[PDB]
Design a protein around this ligand. Structure first.
Ligand code: ZYC
Ligand code: ZYC
Ligand code: CL
Ligand code: CL
Ligand code: CL
Ligand code: CL
Ligand code: CL
Ligand code: CL
Ligand code: CL
Ligand code: CL
Ligand code: CL
Ligand code: CL
Ligand code: CL
Ligand code: CL
Ligand code: CL
Ligand code: CL
Ligand code: CL
Ligand code: CL
Ligand code: CL
Ligand code: CL
Ligand code: CL
Ligand code: CL
Ligand code: CL
Ligand code: CL
Ligand code: CL
Ligand code: CL
Ligand code: CL
Ligand code: CL
Ligand code: CL
Ligand code: CL
Ligand code: CL
Ligand code: CL
Ligand code: CL
Ligand code: CL
Ligand code: CL
Ligand code: CL
Ligand code: CL
Ligand code: CL
Ligand code: CL
Ligand code: NA
Ligand code: NA
Ligand code: NA
Ligand code: NA
Ligand code: NA
Ligand code: NA
Ligand code: NA
Ligand code: NA
Ligand code: NA
Ligand code: NA
Ligand code: NA
Ligand code: NA
Ligand code: NA
Ligand code: NA
Ligand code: NA
Ligand code: NA
Ligand code: NA
Ligand code: NA
Ligand code: NA
Ligand code: NA
Ligand code: NA
Ligand code: NA
Ligand code: NA
Ligand code: NA
Ligand code: NA
Ligand code: NA
Ligand code: NA
Ligand code: NA
Ligand code: NA
Ligand code: NA
Ligand code: NA
Ligand code: NA
Ligand code: NA
Ligand code: NA
Ligand code: NA
Ligand code: NA
Ligand code: NA
Ligand code: NA
Ligand code: NA
Ligand code: NA
Ligand code: NA
Ligand code: NA
Ligand code: NA
Ligand code: NA
Ligand code: NA
Ligand code: NA
Ligand code: NA
Ligand code: NA
Ligand code: NA
Ligand code: NA
Ligand code: NA
Ligand code: NA
Ligand code: NA
Ligand code: NA
Ligand code: NA
Ligand code: NA
Ligand code: NA
Ligand code: NA
Ligand code: NA
Ligand code: NA
Ligand code: NA
Ligand code: NA
Ligand code: NA
Ligand code: NA
Ligand code: NA
Ligand code: NA
Ligand code: NA
Ligand code: NA
Ligand code: NA
Ligand code: NA
Ligand code: NA
Ligand code: NA
Ligand code: NA
Ligand code: NA
Ligand code: NA
Ligand code: NA
Ligand code: NA
Ligand code: NA
Ligand code: NA
Ligand code: NA
Ligand code: NA
Ligand code: NA
Ligand code: NA
Ligand code: NA
Lengths: 250, 250
C-alpha cells in the first residue's frame, strides 16, 4: 500500500485446516491482485511462482500464493487432497482477497494442477475474476485417471484402490475417482474474459494438447506454445512464463 | 454382531472437522450395512431416518447415519457447507464402513439433499456400492440455483451474493455457485446397479420430476410415487418410505 511494500505471511482456514500463504504487497492505495496456485506435490515457493510474484510486484500488481491442503506448510495429509478440496482452498483464499479494500481487479494464475484449480474457480466466479493465466494446466489428470495411468503409476480405472503409493507419497484413491469425473472444461468454459495459456512444447508431464483444448473452449484466450520448454519452465525457459504472465496482467 | 446389538456413537474426521454419527448394530457375524444421509438443514436423527435405521436393524441390516458438516452435532459452520463438501463427508463415512470386517454389501440411502449426496457418491463408487435408495432426491437444487430462487429466497444467479440469509441461517454463496454446475445426473448415472426412487406427489420442496428424471437416467431403477405424500413423508406417509426402503435392501 502507500506505507508498506514487501512480503507478509497470511494464514486462512478452510474447514478445519490452516492454509499458509505469502502476500507480496506493492506500492499504491489501489492495485490489482493475482492469486497464484502451485501444482501437484509442489508448494507456494517454487522458483517459478516466486519469480512470477516478484515480477508482478515490480509492476505494482499484488499477489498471494498459498500452500494447498496436503502441501508445503498448510495443514492436512497429502493422501487426503483432491482437486476438489483444492478448489475449496482456492475459494477460501478468494474470500480473503475479494474483501481487501485495496484490491481493484482480481486475477488467477495457476501452474499445472493449480491451473485446473484456477480455470475451474474462474468458471465458478466469472462475474468476479478479471483475467486468468494458465501455465501448463494439467487438465490431462482427468484422462490419465480414466486411462489408469497417473505419471507412470498404473492401477485399474474401473476399480481404483483405496490408496496409491506414488513416489514417496500416498495418493488418495478418492483423488483419482474425483479426477475421472471432474467437469474441468465444462466449468472452466464459463469464464469469457481474457485468458492467457502458456505451455512448453517439451512438457512430458502434461501434453500441450491440454492448452490447445482450453484455447478451443475459451471465448477470449491467447495461446503461447514455448518451443523447447518443459513442464516447469525450468532454467532458461522460466522468463518466457514470467514475461508472458506479467505482460498479460498489466 | 454376535455379541453386541443396539446403538453406538461413532466419530470420524474429515479435513479438520469431526463428524458425529449413530451406528445401529444388528445381530450376526456378517451383515449388510446402509449409510443413511439426511437433508438440507436436517440432522441424522429426524423421525424418518431413525425409523429407517430401526426398520433395517429389525431385518439385521446395520446402518450408520452422520450429521453432515454444518449440521446437527458435527463440526463446521452451516454457512460453509456445500453439496460438494457433504460428498467429501460421505466419502469419509464410506472409508469407515468399507473397512469394517463385518460388512458384506454396502447400501446408500439418502433423503432430499442427502439423496443428491448418495446418488453422486454411488456414481463415484459404482464398483463398491451395491444398492441405492433415494427419497425425494433434491436434484432440483441445481435448477433452483440457476433460476435464482432457492426455497423462496431470491438472488441474482449471474452474480450470487457472498452469503444469503436464509430463514434463521446464513447460506454460503459458494453453496449456490457449486449447485449451479453440479454434474448431478452425469455422475449419478454411472451407477448401474439397483436403485429405488421414492417421492411424494405432494412434495412442495422438490418436484417429483426430480425422481422421474433419475428414473430415466438410471440403468436399473424402480420408481415409487407416493400419492399425497409430502417432502418428508411425514406422519401417515412415513411407513411408505420406510417399507419400500426396507423391502428394497433386504
Ligand atoms: C507441480 C506441477 O505439475 C502437476 O501439477 C501435474 C499434475 C498432474 C499431471 C498429470 C496427472 O495425471 C496428475 O494426476 C495426479 C497430475
Ligand atoms: C431436509 C430435506 O430437504 C432438503 O434437503 C431439500 C434441499 C433442497 C431443495 C431445493 C433447493 O433449492 C435447495 O437449495 C439449497 C435445497
Ligand atoms: Cl494505503
Ligand atoms: Cl503517503
Ligand atoms: Cl521484502
Ligand atoms: Cl493472517
Ligand atoms: Cl487449529
Ligand atoms: Cl493503477
Ligand atoms: Cl526470492
Ligand atoms: Cl525467497
Ligand atoms: Cl514441500
Ligand atoms: Cl501438511
Ligand atoms: Cl480432453
Ligand atoms: Cl483394489
Ligand atoms: Cl464437481
Ligand atoms: Cl472432457
Ligand atoms: Cl459437455
Ligand atoms: Cl476458466
Ligand atoms: Cl506443441
Ligand atoms: Cl512435476
Ligand atoms: Cl525468472
Ligand atoms: Cl461377531
Ligand atoms: Cl455366540
Ligand atoms: Cl439399543
Ligand atoms: Cl468412534
Ligand atoms: Cl479437533
Ligand atoms: Cl445374511
Ligand atoms: Cl427411536
Ligand atoms: Cl431416539
Ligand atoms: Cl439441528
Ligand atoms: Cl456445528
Ligand atoms: Cl433436470
Ligand atoms: Cl452481490
Ligand atoms: Cl442437468
Ligand atoms: Cl451431459
Ligand atoms: Cl447414482
Ligand atoms: Cl406425481
Ligand atoms: Cl424442509
Ligand atoms: Cl415410521
Ligand atoms: Na518490507
Ligand atoms: Na514474508
Ligand atoms: Na503474521
Ligand atoms: Na473455518
Ligand atoms: Na485451524
Ligand atoms: Na514493491
Ligand atoms: Na496510490
Ligand atoms: Na512445480
Ligand atoms: Na510435502
Ligand atoms: Na505441514
Ligand atoms: Na499449517
Ligand atoms: Na489434506
Ligand atoms: Na496436518
Ligand atoms: Na499423506
Ligand atoms: Na478496472
Ligand atoms: Na486427456
Ligand atoms: Na478430459
Ligand atoms: Na473411459
Ligand atoms: Na491401467
Ligand atoms: Na510424468
Ligand atoms: Na506402476
Ligand atoms: Na474406480
Ligand atoms: Na495400491
Ligand atoms: Na466414470
Ligand atoms: Na462429470
Ligand atoms: Na465431481
Ligand atoms: Na472436462
Ligand atoms: Na497473451
Ligand atoms: Na517435462
Ligand atoms: Na504423460
Ligand atoms: Na488451439
Ligand atoms: Na496450436
Ligand atoms: Na479461444
Ligand atoms: Na482481444
Ligand atoms: Na499459438
Ligand atoms: Na491459437
Ligand atoms: Na500468440
Ligand atoms: Na516459442
Ligand atoms: Na528442450
Ligand atoms: Na534450461
Ligand atoms: Na524473471
Ligand atoms: Na529480464
Ligand atoms: Na444395547
Ligand atoms: Na447410541
Ligand atoms: Na464412544
Ligand atoms: Na483427517
Ligand atoms: Na477434529
Ligand atoms: Na438388533
Ligand atoms: Na452369524
Ligand atoms: Na428433513
Ligand atoms: Na443447526
Ligand atoms: Na455443533
Ligand atoms: Na463435532
Ligand atoms: Na461446515
Ligand atoms: Na465448529
Ligand atoms: Na453458519
Ligand atoms: Na452378496
Ligand atoms: Na431443475
Ligand atoms: Na439440472
Ligand atoms: Na441458466
Ligand atoms: Na431471481
Ligand atoms: Na420450499
Ligand atoms: Na426473497
Ligand atoms: Na453467480
Ligand atoms: Na445477501
Ligand atoms: Na453457469
Ligand atoms: Na458442470
Ligand atoms: Na463443480
Ligand atoms: Na445434472
Ligand atoms: Na422397489
Ligand atoms: Na412438502
Ligand atoms: Na419449489
Ligand atoms: Na420416469
Ligand atoms: Na411417472
Ligand atoms: Na431407469
Ligand atoms: Na430387475
Ligand atoms: Na411409477
Ligand atoms: Na417408471
Ligand atoms: Na413401481
Ligand atoms: Na401411492
Ligand atoms: Na395430501
Ligand atoms: Na399425514
Ligand atoms: Na416404521
Ligand atoms: Na407396520
Amino acid at each position: 500500500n502507500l506505507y508498506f511494500q514487501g512480503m507478509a505471511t497470511i494464514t486462512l482456514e478452510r474447514d478445519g485446516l490452516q492454509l499458509v500463504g505469502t502476500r507480496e504487497e506493492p506500492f499504491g492505495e489501489i492495485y490489482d491482485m493475482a492469486i497464484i496456485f502451485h501444482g501437484f506435490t509442489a508448494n507456494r515457493n517454487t522458483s517459478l511462482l516466486r519469480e512470477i510474484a516478484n515480477s508482478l510486484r515490480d509492476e505494482n500488481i499484488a499477489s498471494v500464493r498459498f500452500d494447498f491442503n496436503g502441501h508445503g506448510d498448510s495443514d492436512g495429509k497429502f493422501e487426503n487432497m483432491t482437486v476438489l478440496n483444492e478448489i475449496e482452498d482456492a475459494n477460501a483464499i478468494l474470500n480473503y482477497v475479494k474483501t481487501d479494500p485495496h484490491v481493484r481487479n482480481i486475477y488467477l494464475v495457476g501452474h499445472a494442477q493449480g491451473g485446473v484449480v484456477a480455470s475451474m474457480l474462474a468458471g465458478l466466479y466469472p462475474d468476479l475474476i478479471k483475467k486468468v493465466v494458465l501455465l501448463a494446466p494439467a487438465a490431462t489428470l482427468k484422462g490419465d485417471a480414466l486411462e489408469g495411468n497417473t505419471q507412470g503409476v498404473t492401477y485399474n480405472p474401473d476399480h481404483i484402490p483405496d490408496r496409491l503409493p506414488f513416489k514417496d507419497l500416498t495418493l488418495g484413491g478418492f483423488y483419482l475417482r474425483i479426477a475421472q469425473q471432474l467437469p474441468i472444461y465444462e466449468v472452466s468454459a464459463q469464464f469469457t474474459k481474457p485468458v492467457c495459456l502458456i505451455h512448453g512444447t517439451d512438457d512430458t508431464v502434461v501434453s500441450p494438447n491440454a492448452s490447445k483444448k482450453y484455447d478451443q473452449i475459451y471465448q477470449n484466450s491467447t495461446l503461447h506454445l514455448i518451443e523447447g520448454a518443459d513442464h516447469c519452465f525450468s532454467d532458461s525457459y522460466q522468463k518466457n512464463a514470467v514475461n508472458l504472465t506479467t505482460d498479460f496482467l498489466q
